[PDB]
Symmetry: D2
Subunit: 337 residues, 4 copies
């Protein structure tokens, strides 16, 4: 039962599918990439298995309109990836109903909406903050966002916050982050937006610290003009946890660390663990942080089943997530239509 | 022009002189020395008296806590509360040396649970399957038995019953910071960070408080005693007002994620912190907020252009007790009376 | 001003377009795109003809290898030769696409041994005790049986006997580069990097060649057949002359340590490389040469001030086959005839 | 058999010895630091055990004048640490004959000598290479070295290289790196120098790629004025390996990665493994590099005994090595005099 190390032979010419396939026998993180392709393809193939359970009960127990499949896939990603071109990548998966639950941080919501109003630009990591600040330019890694983008966001968002307060106070709406994100996706009304497609396809988005970013800034300023908006995080905890509890199987695809990683993993502890899991991040374990914990720490908690074969790829997801999608979801497009 | 020179142990082991020599040793030892200077600048500023004019503006908050000349925000990730840095943080809070805490849910939880049962030393390499089979959970190279959370459940559930009763019959509008104050009062134990925080009127912000064991318990509680609301909007106003009406601010941030961003974003509301120290092991190259250098925050206005912030690239379990030894602990008499 | 935009999989899986889209995706995907541009600039320069004047100066070396308009230095660490990147490197060397190799001792050794027996896939977490008890050596997530080195001993010892004989009776003055050429000729196998390097007159520098299995064998051999000398001074002249008399130079450096420094230092002798790509996962914060950004080398004169060098922060087992696919492999016809 | 997590209580005041002792129960890398203190103290205590073996045989078999002790300690460190203030730290250990073998890279030799002629200065990592180069300033991390330092080095070194060539050609001297380093230490004749003390105390220094740096540049330029110097690496392989083979016990203290780490570890494979080992570095395992390999990879090779209890501290050695020395060697100063 032994596989030999061998890399792609460019004497064959350039066949990119064969080149990507060769990662599996190349070693180090290339091999982990091949293992991740296999784990995600196992999630997809399980998802496509037919099932025959009670539609109305499920909906009652989860308080969700989304129909159950044979594998509930949780996709988590940090804010920076929505500032990156991986935004397109994630939007594709959600547009085609390929995942079931989204978890991201506040920036990961608002920068998708802002990109429908104005673009993000390429820059460099080493650009100095004094000069950028003096020019009204904000840096995100090697990306750049002008202050004017947030001005356009403000103008777009304040009338929606007005309606939200009115609906809460006179139509009994109890706002949560996931409910707000669904509404913003409907309002942005733009097929380039992740959250437009999420609400159209009844994919919920959880973001328990939704106030930590520009949407927070705007909610804050808005509240001195139109007081009273409340965002409850308790009901959203019930919604995410019941997505895990009532699943047939679950898979986790987690890009980055922080709350998005922990929140997906903790939901899956409710069912004594995910059946499949892929982490892609650059965090290291040695400082004891949750972000840097290997999948095998999650096993000790019951967040990943002891019989699962989870995979971590240690790499920037801007490089590896498009390749992963290319070899997995994008190959199964036939079945998602 | 300062020359590189390390401590000369031919002098013997003079600990203070050895620590002072980090400044001229280079690499992260020099950044450690710069961090000592930055924190001592925050303390020196904090102990200036407020002028009449400054006192007027600073008094503009409804906070019970007396205002000082430098409001210090201390942020830390959950793993650090599982570590012995819990004692370091507790000491600072106990003696009113910082003014605002920001942490994640684990960072609240695990302080309270340590008053019920201890955390143990283990190894990073322990395998999740065998740990899970023995009911032992791993946090880096630390270990918490399942039983710890059983005791937490027994302790917490009667409090949740009281909180719901107070909500529904006494008009209480819970937020994360108000719950954390109450949990600190209930734990009633001088070893607890949150006990001292509520005693000293130090607010604790944790916008994703539902992401861990507290969340598990609220979740199960919601089925027997439904309706608890935790609003994050009111807490956003509260943390942002702490920054807006400060005479000066300092940020001391251990780790990344929400704690780092939430503190920094609040300080953007005053066009930047005056002083800032980051201690973490995250790298910038993947674009993550966690790995962003202080100079990225300058571009946003989260750190003032004329500030001299510092990042120490190191595990805070090593650096933070040394930093406190060289700064706050040296001025303890000033924080007493 | 280039806008951020990721590949849109609604277009289908067009691999070339997906790779081209890394440039506008951000973070390290953008650095990957910049690295493709840098390497293609080296190749475009290499394929310019030499003017009369340039030909005159470049001809000033005693190298059998025809001079070109860009001398490309390729450096890589030993682990990459244990990986399937050995095939990638072999292809470039086979088709004369680079001009100078620099590696460590393992980087020589393990190429030769792979012609005698394979390397296998394993896992990073396998425990050393059980591996040692089974005579299995671990390299990251790769595995080499002890037997591999027995075969290497049987192969190498008769060659060492001949080298000593040629030293003592034919005046040969061995250096690392001369031994590596001889080992490549002896292995006589088209799967070997060093076979093709000596066939194509590509010198290989490895100033610490005694640091691994070759060293073990020289050591034991020294007791039966004493006196072998390996001079590193002559090799220093040889590598430095490759830089000094180049029309232009490019550096492609995979990993850190001696391979990175030795290539960069040689190029200081011409006041800097014209083009440079680093691929590695080292961080700058500990001051290590391995983690130093290209811009540190600019301060020394190792990279020209007007160059646009690039570092991709990633495991080269993922990135380097993609880089070659987008650069050298696209111009293969130009390197043939 | 369980130890509870507890940090230092600053309500005790500031006792730095107690603070450092508390690292052991603080967790994460603080705990690994405590384990490293224990491993190095075990090396020292073993070294001090008396022994009673044949003095003349030992010297014959090792071709060394250094007397055997009960534990042979190998100390390795990368170049950057000699540019840092850790130079003083290492010099102290060698001055007092506390370690037995030194391994470093070329920069780690020459920058100790240059510091006896002119100092290294503090700077910042972010200083731009163009401006530094235009001012004749070279950057090493956040340290700075003027070009003039290398001019002074040249003037000092060229007459010594003259004598070395003369002694080789007319007194039969066969130069190796360790023999050259001993001579340079004798010539520098300055008690601030590591290598002055090493040669005085008959501590050999191995550096198989000694030509990779400024000493190489100078040897290179010198050879066009005074040709013929040869530096053999084979005889130095015999000297380092016999230090391991004939030891009673061995310990490895390795700061950084690269050749210094591999070369010490490979020598100890000759005796089927070191009895004690401490690594301090910031390299990560996931790219398969030797630098980032955990001690447990070395166990699979036989480089560390299966019954050893090695320790890696993941941290910048500029921070932790002075603390480690303070708690170990500097406490045992009594016995080394």
């Amino acid at each position: 039962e032994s596989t030999q190390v061998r890399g792609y032979d460019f004497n064959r010419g350039v066949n990119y599918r064969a080149l990507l396939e060769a990662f599996g026998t190349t070693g180090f993180q290339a091999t982990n990439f091949g293992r991740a392709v296999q784990q995600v393809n196992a999630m997809i193939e399980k998802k496509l298995e037919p099932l025959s359970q009670d539609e109305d009960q499920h909906a009652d127990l989860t308080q969700s309109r989304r129909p159950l499949t044979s594998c509930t896939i949780f996709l988590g990603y940090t804010s920076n990836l929505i500032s990156s071109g991986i935004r397109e990548t994630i939007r594709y998966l959600v547009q085609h109903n390929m995942v079931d639950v989204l978890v991201t941080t506040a920036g990961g919501v608002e920068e998708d909406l802002i990109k429908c109003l104005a673009p993000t630009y390429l820059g460099e990591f080493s650009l100095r903050g004094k000069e950028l600040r003096e020019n009204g330019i904000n840096r995100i890694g090697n990306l750049l966002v002008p202050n004017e983008n947030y001005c356009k966001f403000e103008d777009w968002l304040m009338p929606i916050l007005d309606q939200m307060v009115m609906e809460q106070n006179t139509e009994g709406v109890k706002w949560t982050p996931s409910k707000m994100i669904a509404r913003l996706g409907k309002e942005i009304n733009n097929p380039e937006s992740v959250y437009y497609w999420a609400q159209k396809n009844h994919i919920p988005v959880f973001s328990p610290a939704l106030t930590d970013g520009s949407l927070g800034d705007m909610i804050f300023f808005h509240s001195y003009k139109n007081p009273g908006l409340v965002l409850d995080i308790v009901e959203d905890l019930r919604l995410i946890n019941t997505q895990a509890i009532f699943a047939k199987c679950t898979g986790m695809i987690i890009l980055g660390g922080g709350v998005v990683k922990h929140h997906i993993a903790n939901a899956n502890l409710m069912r004594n663990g995910a059946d499949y899991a892929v982490y892609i991040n650059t965090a290291q374990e040695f400082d004891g942080s949750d972000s840097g914990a290997r999948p095998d720490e999650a096993v000790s908690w019951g967040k990943i089943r002891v019989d699962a074969q989870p995979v971590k790829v240690y790499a920037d997801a801007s490089l590896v997530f498009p390749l992963l999608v290319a070899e997995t979801f994008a190959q199964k497009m036939d079945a998602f239509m």
